[PDB]
Amino acid sequence: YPAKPEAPGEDASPEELSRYYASLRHYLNLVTRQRY
């Protein structure tokens, strides 16, 4: 459930939304490895 992170930082639920971050994270992953 969308309840646990009771603090100011990031308040968003996964499913379709985190699909943007997780997908964009993929490219950013093989791009970071080059200089990680």
Q: What is the DSSP string of 5-24?
A: --SSS-----SSSHHHHHHH
> Are the C-beta atoms of residues 15 and 2 closer than 8 Å to each other?
no
> Are the C-beta atoms of residues 13 and 2 closer than 8 Å to each other?
yes
CB atoms within 10 A of CB 21: 13
Query: 18 Cβ partners below 8 Å, 6+ apart?
Result: 12
Elucidation method:
NMR
Query: 13 Cβ partners below 8 Å, 6+ apart?
Result: 2
Q: Distance (Å, rounded) from C-alpha 17 to C-alpha 10?
A: 13
Residue type, 28: L
